[PDB]
Amino acid sequence: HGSLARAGKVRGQTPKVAKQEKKKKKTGRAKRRMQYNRRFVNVVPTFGKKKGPNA
Amino acid sequence: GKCRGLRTARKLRSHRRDQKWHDKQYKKAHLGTALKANPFGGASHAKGIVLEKVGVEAKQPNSAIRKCVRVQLIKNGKKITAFVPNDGCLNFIEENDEVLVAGFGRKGHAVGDIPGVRFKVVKVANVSLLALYKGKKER
Amino acid sequence: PVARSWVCRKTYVTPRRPFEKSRLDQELKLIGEYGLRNKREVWRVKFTLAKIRKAARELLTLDEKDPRRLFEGNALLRRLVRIGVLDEGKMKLDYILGLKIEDFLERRLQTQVFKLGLAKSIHHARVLIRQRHIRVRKQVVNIPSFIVRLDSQKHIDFSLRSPYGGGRPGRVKRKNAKK
Amino acid sequence: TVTIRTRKFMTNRLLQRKQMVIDVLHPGKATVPKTEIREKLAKMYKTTPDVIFVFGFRTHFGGGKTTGFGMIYDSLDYAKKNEPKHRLARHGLYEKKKTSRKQRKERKNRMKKVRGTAKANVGAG
RNA sequence: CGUGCCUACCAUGGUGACCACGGGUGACGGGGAAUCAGGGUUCGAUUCCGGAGAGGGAGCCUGAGAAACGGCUACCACAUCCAAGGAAGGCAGCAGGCGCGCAAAUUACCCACUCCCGACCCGGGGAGGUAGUGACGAAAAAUAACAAUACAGGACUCUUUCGAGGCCCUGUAAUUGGAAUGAGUCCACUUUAAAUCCUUUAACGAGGAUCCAUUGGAGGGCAAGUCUGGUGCCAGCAGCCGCG
Ligand SMILES: [Mg+2]
Ligand SMILES: [Mg+2]
Ligand SMILES: [Mg+2]
Ligand SMILES: [Mg+2]
Ligand SMILES: [Mg+2]
Ligand SMILES: [Mg+2]
Ligand SMILES: [Mg+2]
Ligand SMILES: [Mg+2]
Ligand SMILES: [Mg+2]
Ligand SMILES: [Mg+2]
């Protein structure tokens, strides 16, 4: 009836960007060590109503 | 009320066995026509051979054309419009292929953009469309 | 057919609500305080505190002179003394119910290592029990999840290991540069 | 120089041997061999090592003790009688040399085929 | 051996709405497993006990024991060899192979352990035991730490403190040891029927090209961007609402 033509119009028109180097990340004990050290032991010099982990 | 006397446990069995069929769930799970009318033969996955490519229309608040494959199962011999999942990947599916298929979400319904598709492509000659889309293993 | 064994227990809890802000607060303060690996061992200790409170409530369902209560209720309480969760005073089944999760996080190896000195900022204290450098009594201990009882409780004496014994596996790789 | 005590002891009057549980304390080195601990038992009871046998040694996770069972026989034939054919052989007292399957089991079929003096062929070769 | 178990004779009974009889079964039954308030709901071919069957279905020799099938005969269905005249067949035993499927492990080592058989202290045993494969799973568990010193992202009790800290983390692609600790290369012991693995023990083996953690997502449900650049009801994502 209609076409099967545009098989990935956007994925064909993707301007690719190479995934750039970032230093390799701690896991297990140590990632959750800095997850705790990011936002619970240390935020208290501000108040607690704003929510900005990514903004 | 109920038949609450002490010796009425046959009457409660015979009544509870009589009302349980009007549920949709117990009737499909325990009547024989659900086992021997559907495709897949009461399994989870099924390998199948491409008859052709079929592109079906869409419903109204999501106007598009969805891109699917008619499939001849080796097991059953039945005909199925299985949705080609990914974003390109109409290309990576071809004629006369091993096409593993499975349902979307629930066997008695569909997903709310298509006229009739219930099925979804996994393998292309034992190579998944997760592989073909990225990780580029082989056709 | 074969005979070795077939038995298994899943010392683990999956929680029910996956996405609560309120739950992640209590567990992220719990990781960073007692220096843990991951959240499955947060749930292990609760599964024990689940497994305790099953028997604690069951033996309140029974009669007073119930000898099945008198043997099972006492011996559970003696087990709590031999770990040292409780006091050596209160021997009642309701005082079992008053327990908490933080007693068990104290009686783990590193925190009694943190109470017996030579531990030095908890994430390091995980390491000195992982690297074969803290042993209890005569048997050499390695796994950090060791409940310290009260019959040992004190005897942390690790012979022939580099901050106590010496022995030269590796500083010879330093002294060979210094020859 | 190694620290050995026998904890749990027996005297087997029926088998004419003695049975003792041997804790070998290794504070230092790798686990002292089959041979040298057998010489410790040969010297602690002052009897001959060619008639004194031992087997079995674990190692309990860092330094520690290794545990096994000592055997002391009187005569070598007393040692041969009340020991199995394998546990002698690690000193060299027993050799079998037909320890293979499918040579036992091919001959069990080709002897089954013929019957008689013709089997005395294949019963020879 | 007791009985319609058959045969003879004779009577005319038996079971049924308390679901009989007739089907269906994706029914081997149990002991059990999953799910967790209580009460249930769904599986249970699967090591233990009991029944059945060796392609189908019949028939019998020997034996205390079989209607045996790694016994025998006949038919049917498959099916190999051949001098065409005939003979041997039977893996839902162990491996393996084909066919079948979404679907499941190598023609291994050995009676050392567990037990069993025999005329038997001695020979037997793919029953079993052991390795190879193995992410169905389950238990414990590093993944680059880790403490310092140091730039400071700078907070904290405290005295005007614009900081002494016997209190702290942090971005440190800043330096250091315990050259830590195992992962492997690898003497030896040992375990083990021999070898194998854990372990024990000898040396070597970490500063980010290293000895490397991915999987799903980021409108609401639902933990987490109005951040950019492409896309412009097309491509497509989304288990439902819907977004283009
Ligand atoms: Mg339950
Ligand atoms: Mg129940
Ligand atoms: Mg049985
Ligand atoms: Mg039979
Ligand atoms: Mg047979
Ligand atoms: Mg057979
Ligand atoms: Mg994705
Ligand atoms: Mg997003
Ligand atoms: Mg949210
Ligand atoms: Mg989803």
Q: Are strands D17-25 and B98-103 parallel, antiparallel or unpaired?
A: unpaired
- Angle D79-D82-D83 from CA coordinates, rounded to 5°: 75
The CA–CA distances, whole Å, from D28 to C111, C161, D31 equal: 30, 12, 9
Place of tokens 């190579």: B127
For residue D122, the CA-to-ligand 6 centroid distance in Å is 28
All residues at 6 or more sequence positions from B82 whose CB lies less than 8 Å from its CB, including other chains: B48, B68, B69, B71, B99, B101, B117, B119, B120, B121
All residues at 6 or more sequence positions from D20 whose CB lies less than 8 Å from its CB, including other chains: D6, D7, D8, D9, D10, D69, D70
Q: Are strands B119-124 and B79-83 parallel, antiparallel or unpaired?
A: parallel
For residue B105, the CA-to-ligand 10 centroid distance in Å is 9
Which of 45-104 (B) contact A at CB < 8 A? Answer: 53, 55, 57, 65, 67, 87-91
Three-class SS state of B28: helix
Q: Are strands B119-124 and D52-55 parallel, antiparallel or unpaired?
A: unpaired
Technique behind the model: cryo-EM
Residue B34 is given by DSSP the state G
D34 CB and strand E closer than 7 A: yes
Q: Which residues pair with B56 in a beta bridge?
A: B66
Three-class SS state of B120: strand
For residue C2, the CA-to-ligand 3 centroid distance in Å is 15
Residue D32 is given by DSSP the state P
Rounded, the Å distance between the CA of C171 and C1' of E207 is: 18
Contact assignment for C35 to A29 by CB distance below 8 Å: yes
Q: Which residues pair with D65 in a beta bridge?
A: D25
Distance, in Å, from the CA atom of D42 to the CA atom of B115, rounded to the nearest integer, reads: 90
Distance, in Å, from the CA atom of B55 to the CA atom of B95, rounded to the nearest integer, reads: 15
- CB-contacted nucleotides of strand E (7 Å): 18-19, 24, 26, 36, 47-48, 101-103, 109-113, 121, 124-125, 127-130, 137-148, 153, 155-156, 168-173, 177-182, 187-194, 199-205, 208-210, 212-213, 216, 218, 222-226, 229-231, 233-244
Instruction: List phi, psi (to 5°) of B7.
Output: -110, 20
Rounded to the nearest 10 degrees, how much is the dihedral formed by the CA atoms of B10, B13, B18, B23? 170
Contact between D53 and D87 (Cβ < 8 Å):
yes
Q: Which residues of A touch C28 (CB under 8 A)?
A: 32, 35-36, 39-40
Percent helix, strand, coil in chain B (nearest 5)? 20, 25, 55
